Subunit: 647 residues, 4 copies
């Protein structure tokens, strides 16, 4: 639909407050909201309504009227569910290790937020003091430690650990930061510290808690949120690769989408890239009288299908996470009746994770092909061998990254296979079909991580590639006239009263380019002597009817190259002398892509790399720098940059 783009969605999510308290009313909770609560420690509370309180209280009352095994049964439903694996002791912990078998804290916080929001719909019949137990945990930084695996997503077990924690189970353990450091204390031990009192689960109040898809919906919401970002970064990387490659903006022309193949997201993607490329002095906007490969040229038709899936996933997950009661059985109250269904079958969130993971693998394949092309000397239209600043003979700057990019891409491929086709006949066959939503959600989450390493690698590389390209442009700017000059100083007199000027200038220059594009692997000196050497053979053809010794041309050849090698060395020192805030790239880069350049180059401190050898020094590794770009993506810091350049 040409109304609501991924960007609209990202801006909405990014607008979510982290300070103001989030109010759960059972219907307006959105994806940006759950993410702010899970990761940004946003305060959370069941909306101060009365309507909400009444329907809640009414649900409970309707049940009270239909005291013994009611509580006992709950204990029996919680017992068999606390069956997951977790480190038995703290002795197993090690530096940077220890909690691998536990669900990420943000997933648990997001799960509790979604758990409460749905219980406010007055269908579950669980006391308001129980929902409050959960919001207090969230507001006091108390997060239950729950096993990573064990659920088939009909999320009974992980949810039970949450219930056990609030109900103060003896073996229940929780996580919490106690001024300065983080600790893992027992449930009743943590609650004691914050003056919180353990709740006591009553009639059917246990199924109303352990039933549901809150844990899946939570991790899935975190994953879709991260994937949107990666999607927009991919598009930004495309625009910047079009620039570094000196490609064509025309592939993103409205006629090639809006008109001829009106897929709303093909239009959306082409529109975004078109926008990013506007005002670019790197990319080509017109031609007068040429190829440009699929990685760049077919990028909208490649990413477009993926984007609609991500937009679709967003529709599904906002309904799932903010407007659905996934418990069972459910009460109708106003109609005085209980219904037995299966709203706990998280096939909806599983379906979004399966589709997103395949999409994450398609985005990675696209960007990999663009990046590997740009890193291929015989394909990147002139750029230095491995994006090395100095002589390639002792510099292979990005070769390893080119390799790492393939490694990430391969892994995304395997990760992309479906999880939902591996359903087993669980629970004495009563749960013969289960969604496997959290397992799918977990796989998609790893794919986000792997794509992030790939895209952080691509960003690092294009930056370096456009700086180099900026250097080529600075050089060309001055060498263009210099060629004309050194020509006349050596041939003007050699032949006057002829047309041996406008022609020799046009053919020499046309021959120089032709050869220099497939000689970008040569070290500086040999490259230029090779260039004009070929250029000489061109003068011999235009100036056939002229009086000149072969030593009178060989002098023009050694002088032309000499100037080129001296020029190039000049432009280079100028660049490495000026701070990045003054980079020559900032005068060719589009105003919008210039925003990401500055973010990485200025705010993240990762600069262009000269080359250990040349510098005669081993500087902070490339990896240490890629790692910094990677971390900006995982923390989300880059999100606003992306929004700002695409808004």
């Amino acid at each position: 639909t040409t109304q609501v783009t991924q960007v609209d969605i990202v801006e909405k999510m990014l607008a979510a407050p982290t300070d103001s308290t989030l109010e759960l009313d059972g219907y307006s909770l959105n994806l940006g909201d759950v993410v702010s609560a899970a990761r940004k420690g946003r305060p959370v509370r069941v909306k101060d309504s009365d309507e909400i309180r009444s329907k809640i209280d009414k649900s409970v009352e309707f049940l009270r009227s239909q005291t013994e095994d009611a509580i006992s049964l709950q204990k029996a439903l919680l017992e068999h569910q606390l069956c997951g694996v977790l480190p038995s002791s703290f002795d197993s912990f090690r530096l940077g290790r220890g909690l691998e078998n536990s669900l990420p804290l943000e997933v648990v916080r997001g799960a509790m937020t979604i758990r409460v929001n749905s219980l406010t719909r007055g269908h579950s019949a669980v006391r308001l003091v129980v929902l409050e137990a959960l919001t207090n945990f969230l507001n006091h930084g108390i997060t239950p430690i729950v096993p990573l695996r064990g659920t088939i997503s009909x999320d009974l077990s992980p949810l039970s650990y949450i219930a056990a924690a609030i109900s103060g189970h003896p073996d229940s353990k929780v996580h919490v930061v106690h001024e300065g450091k983080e600790k893992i204390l027992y449930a009743r031990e943590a609650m004691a510290l914050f003056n919180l009192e353990p709740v006591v689960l009553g009639p059917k109040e246990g199924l109303g808690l352990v039933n549901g898809t809150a844990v899946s919906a939570s991790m899935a919401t975190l994953a879709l949120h991260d994937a949107h970002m990666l999607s927009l970064l991919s598009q930004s990387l495309t625009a910047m690769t079009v620039e570094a490659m000196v490609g064509h903006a025309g592939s993103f022309h409205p006629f090639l989408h809006d008109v001829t193949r009106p897929h709303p997201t093909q239009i959306e993607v082409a529109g975004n890239i078109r926008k990013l490329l506007e005002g670019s002095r790197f990319a080509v906007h017109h031609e007068e009288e040429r190829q440009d490969r699929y990685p760049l040229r077919t990028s909208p038709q490649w990413l477009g299908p993926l984007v609609s899936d991500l937009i679709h996933a967003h529709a599904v997950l906002t309904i799932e996470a903010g407007q659905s009661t996934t418990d069972n059985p459910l009460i109708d109250v106003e109609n005085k009746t209980s219904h037995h269904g299966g709203n706990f079958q998280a096939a909806a969130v599983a379906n979004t994770m399966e589709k997103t993971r395949l999409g994450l693998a398609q985005i990675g394949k696209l960007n990999f092909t663009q990046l590997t092309e740009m890193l291929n000397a015989g394909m990147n239209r002139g750029l230095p061998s491995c994006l090395a600043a100095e002589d390639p003979s002792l510099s292979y700057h990005c070769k390893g990254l080119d390799i790492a990019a393939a490694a990430y891409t391969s892994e995304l491929g395997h990760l992309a296979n479906p999880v939902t086709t591996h359903v087993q006949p669980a629970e004495m066959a009563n749960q013969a079909v289960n969604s496997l939503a959290l397992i799918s959600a977990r796989r998609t989450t790893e794919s986000n991580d792997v794509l992030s390493l790939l895209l952080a690698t691509h960003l690092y590389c294009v930056l370096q590639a456009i700086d180099l390209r900026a250097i080529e442009f600075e050089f060309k700017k001055q060498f263009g006239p210099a060629i004309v000059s050194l020509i006349d100083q050596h041939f003007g007199s050699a032949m006057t009263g002829s047309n041996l000027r406008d022609e020799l200038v046009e053919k020499v220059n046309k021959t120089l380019a032709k050869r220099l594009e497939q000689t970008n692997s040569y070290d500086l000196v040999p490259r230029w002597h090779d260039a004009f050497s070929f250029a000489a053979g061109t003068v011999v053809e235009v100036l056939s009817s002229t009086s000149l010794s072969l030593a009178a041309v060989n002098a023009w050849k050694v002088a032309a190259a000499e100037s080129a090698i001296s020029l190039t060395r000049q432009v280079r020192e100028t660049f490495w002398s000026a701070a990045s805030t003054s980079s020559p790239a900032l005068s060719y880069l589009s105003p919008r892509t210039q925003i990401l350049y500055a973010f990485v180059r200025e705010e993240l401190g990762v600069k262009a790399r000269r080359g250990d050898v040349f510098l005669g020094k081993q500087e902070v590794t490339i990896g240490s720098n890629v790692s910094k770009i990677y971390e900006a993506i995982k923390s989300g810091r880059i999100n606003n940059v992306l929004l700002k350049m695409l808004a």
Copy 2:
């Protein structure tokens, strides 16, 4: 969205005329249209309009104004494309074998239809006579033979074999039916049989003919079409299994979907099933004081997500097949400019196919779990062992089908893995990313096929099950009172003046049912003696205070069992004596599901099966029957009976 459902789409598709000529205008082509013209030999033609003819002629005229190599180049860009593999001779052909390496006929006709439509948009710049070359071919049943494999769906090769066929190529075979029998002639050797004249491609009139998605879009349209039907059949099968299982309709109540988890497609599927179940005597509609399993109870939330993808896929494909120019370059006549993009990257159609194939596996899994549960004596609530009409000892009716069901399901799982993750650096890396659309379409088509096998098998089995259920019902109808009769005849006098009446009849009936549930694998005689034998134990409890000999009750037992044995044998013969058109099943089945039962039991001839042993003969095999149902699905005959019961 709650507007437009899968049935709304199917209805619209099945409304596509087969006789009325189809006029292509570059924007109105439907998926119902495309299908009628490819599988229903519906006449096609480029709409008789001046507008169409105008822009067509203009696109050409624009080109003609920017001599020799123009045609040559197109004899080059057609030479290297005719590189697929196909039987070199007819000496290879065998009985029911020979064209495995050729593209299905209907796919070619559809591609032909789609090719033309897109050409009418005037972005191509190809003569109208050429478009007519294809239409004539379609109108005369002239379908070229094209290799099954070879393209990476950037579909150059497949299309080339279509061009060379209407361009009269010496080594360009085709397929047609010459009154009575079909044959495989050569291009000009078939066109000179229908008065057709082979066209000659002019300037860039080859690329505008071989650059496109036509072939993929065609096969994808046929696969999505078939998948829509299978998707409806799966819901029908769900309803009928709820009946055969004497399950609960409450799982499809609007409160458990429309109100609690408002996913449009979960509501859509729940509604469909609720409908089909309305007025069913088999399914339960309300209790009064259970445990339906997930295969039945969670079907809406299981199928809902898949349904939304098929509906999303329809939106993608309609725009692709009926409103997009997937060629390159593209001309903007009313702007005097040529555009170089990449609308040939069929990622859009591959996306639909990838998601559809996964959906087909999810459907298969659901129906399999339903079917296998219904075939499990320990889970099917009292149905006969293997759905055998007579004694189980010498009857294992659907044993093989349960196993075949698992076989088809397993195959569906492996088929569902993605194809788009196996992209290769094709064509000197220029085509580093390619959609693989046709290959994916091909795989999805195979899943359509295997699901058809699974659903045909499920249909066969559910039918036999409800008849057997009908018989159980008729029996329980007459046996109920019989029990109350023989009870007095033997007791009554045994203890008059007390309450040993209402109680003895309740408890005996109750204990009689609890033991029959798990004894449905016994023959008939021992089964019934087992039942009342257990009952007699209940008698000893109720009639504790009474004067009766152990032989007095043993007489009651044998009598009861004898009555039951005779009774069941009676209700059976009554069933097998009456034509299916008078089957007692029609008295319990819902009005809507009865339609499917009648379609199979009558129009198909596939009747219930009593048993080869019993009947002392070997009648047409189970398979031959299942094949009938399968053949009804593949031909599309069952399509209107599906719309009929759901519309």
Copy 3:
């Protein structure tokens, strides 16, 4: 182990007689045997021995001593098994279509052969007359029609259709050839045409006939057989590509395998390639002072692992197909005891198929990367653009095949995913684990097929490449001196008494080669003018101190280029005028690889291609030719030419 190689196995298989009758004795059956009897209509029979007949009769006699229901039960355990799907009528059949849902003929014959062999072991307890029922069927070309799908390879159904065919079932069709043409008759309607008498199964003589792996083992044997050939063809293709690429044979030196990484199969493959490369004029054998890519250089370590699996698979299958009773129960006559186990769980054969299918994808990938590199003008060391004989402008010879290659490879990837991970809780859960052997065998067979398409395409392309290489060689042979000639004719006098001779000839030749490497995409005229134009620049350097006009050298340039243009055009016509049996390629190709070249260029008729444009005509398409090579692989005709060049 270093004993027994893949070739040793192939040799042994291709040594299986087709005329000499095959005698089954329950322990000697080979995989070469099984194949000859299923694909080579080789006569089969239960070895004429008393021992065999003794234990057979004894197994029966043991049973007969522990009347009615005995036969009935077997009419029940055959009823429910004939549940597969197959065309209900012949009105469905079409040209080259009709039996897609039936098991391949050869598979049935093989299963038939294997069934019998296992029965001769006397563990079954089935009459000898029954075994003869099957042998006769095989000897008379009577092959029953059995449904393609249905079994989970615990292969009850498929086999049942074989029993019912020789047991004379009314609804049990079969296939046979009645002098001249093949037909599909009924059981007794075909046996009463060959004087055969339908057998009647007695006590437990049905289970001992339908319980087994026969069908899976059969298809797996045929697939492994084909895979062995493909595996050898892949190594042959590797060697020929090293030639066409003028690569290095050093990568196959024994020190880089036998000594440094002693993996038996890496040594085995390295040896095979080393061999084929012995005495090659194309491949380099030693330097004297490079960079072969992994597709060529790492082929032994890439194919080695896969080869070991095929050899391991052979060991598994031979024991399975020729020395195992996969029925149940099983009788130990000389111990008076019946055993209940599970030798019908074909996990063994599924294992072979799963690993073989993955291997087929690894092979395809390797050969694809080799082929696509050879087709890349920028990587193929000087070969013509798309392997076009004439000017590239109007010739893109193998463009379509590079793309088809990627297409086949992508398909191989998806096919390679496992099938054994999709096991379902079949048959009321009694068969909770089942091998899925036949389904896996079926998939592996398809990979055999698609790899054949890929390798046939690779073979076609390498052939064209070496001819073109041969032409380059013949040209370089005569051009070398020509350069040294025209150099003196124009220079020499220009500067006598100096060293401007040995130097000018070296540097010019050197710079002439460096520019030709990357100019192989130019037509011919501009190409050569481009070359010496660059050369002239080198002249100006060497002949710096000499009296010569710019028109003096420009004369040399044009002269040189003119010479080259004429020369190349001469060596070309010399090539196209001589029959292939006299192709200059035979002078450079290794003795062993020449065998493949001759097999294709002669016996197959597939000649090099000059170009439709140039020749001013449209000759048999590339595809029709590739199809020939493909057909040679499928028929197994190329098998002996493979053994011939490797033996």
Copy 4:
């Protein structure tokens, strides 16, 4: 948490052991003092953090 993006210590220790064992075959041409650098790391519980 913290070291998820690093290879497990045992893999690195096993890698160093295998690295040395193969360098003793006299095909690599790497000084013995270099192989010793690796065994000392292993014997002193020094394990390089690797991505």
